[PDB]
Design an enzyme around this catalytic site. Sequence first.
Site, PDB file in Angstrom:
ATOM      1  N   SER A  45      61.043  -3.276 -12.928  1.00 17.44           N
ATOM      2  CA  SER A  45      60.571  -4.505 -13.383  1.00 17.44           C
ATOM      3  C   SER A  45      59.863  -4.331 -14.810  1.00 17.44           C
ATOM      4  O   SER A  45      59.319  -5.445 -15.454  1.00 17.44           O
ATOM      5  CB  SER A  45      59.735  -5.509 -12.445  1.00 17.44           C
ATOM      6  N   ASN A 107      61.779 -12.654 -10.352  1.00 20.81           N
ATOM      7  CA  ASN A 107      63.124 -12.118 -10.462  1.00 20.81           C
ATOM      8  C   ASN A 107      63.938 -13.108 -11.134  1.00 20.81           C
ATOM      9  O   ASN A 107      64.906 -12.897 -12.108  1.00 20.81           O
ATOM     10  CB  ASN A 107      63.492 -11.441  -9.467  1.00 20.81           C
ATOM     11  N   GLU A 143      69.916  -5.413  -8.975  1.00 17.66           N
ATOM     12  CA  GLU A 143      70.930  -4.292  -9.077  1.00 17.66           C
ATOM     13  C   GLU A 143      70.218  -3.141 -10.365  1.00 17.66           C
ATOM     14  O   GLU A 143      70.606  -1.917  -9.954  1.00 17.66           O
ATOM     15  CB  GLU A 143      72.331  -4.755  -9.411  1.00 17.66           C
TER      16      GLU A 143
END
EC number: 3.5.2.6
Length: 269
Positions: A45, A107, A143
């Site tokens: 992230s 996300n 992913e």
Amino acid sequence: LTNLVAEPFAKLEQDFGGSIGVYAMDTGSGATVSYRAEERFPLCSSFKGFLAAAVLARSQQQAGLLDTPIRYGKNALVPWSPISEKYLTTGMTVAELSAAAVQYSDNAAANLLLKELGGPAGLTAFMRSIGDTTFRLDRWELELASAIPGDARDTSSPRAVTESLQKLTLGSALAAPQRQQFVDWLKGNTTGNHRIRAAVPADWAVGDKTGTCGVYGTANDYAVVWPTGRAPIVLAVYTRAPNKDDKHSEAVIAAAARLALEGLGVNGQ
């Protein structure tokens, strides 16, 4: 001026059971601390900070971009979207999505902003435009977080992360208002209290962006730190480990940050 004082990074990563990569830059003197600094590590992230910078850069040419309302469906709500899930029925602005991506590692927000920039290649292109030839983003959340050993997809190096972070937060890669907005988003991050921030005294300003893959002991943090009375420090700490089930460690990241500050001669904790 690189590694003028050696620090026991090797012992630290051996106790951790993996690899630690560190690059820290004293922006006053230019002195650096460097350990595995040119190896590739998964971004996880941590790409979301650079994503927000790329949005801010685009906002320099598109007035009103940050104010644009974005609506999204339930199918956009990737796991770990703590802010965007609360505004599913209303939408959020580009600026709110950017803040959520940086400060809560949201996300769904990150994927929505990636689409605005033209996907992983668009973010990669922005990084190339500031002179970063190492960064590559290849996939979307979640992913991109596979952290496969030896896989260069969705990786950078600690050195390139630090160099790019310095250009964006302290250098000229963003215009002055956008630069301060990027700094302010990083300062407001909520996910990094046990990482670089745990090595930084409470009376210093600090902004950071974390990353945590959930596999292969892979986690990271990058930060700009303003020790009082001297020039700011930019640093990046990335970890990985050989086995899929290996756990990451926030304490190891904080410990590596402490060693980096010690190596630079910055009196801290």
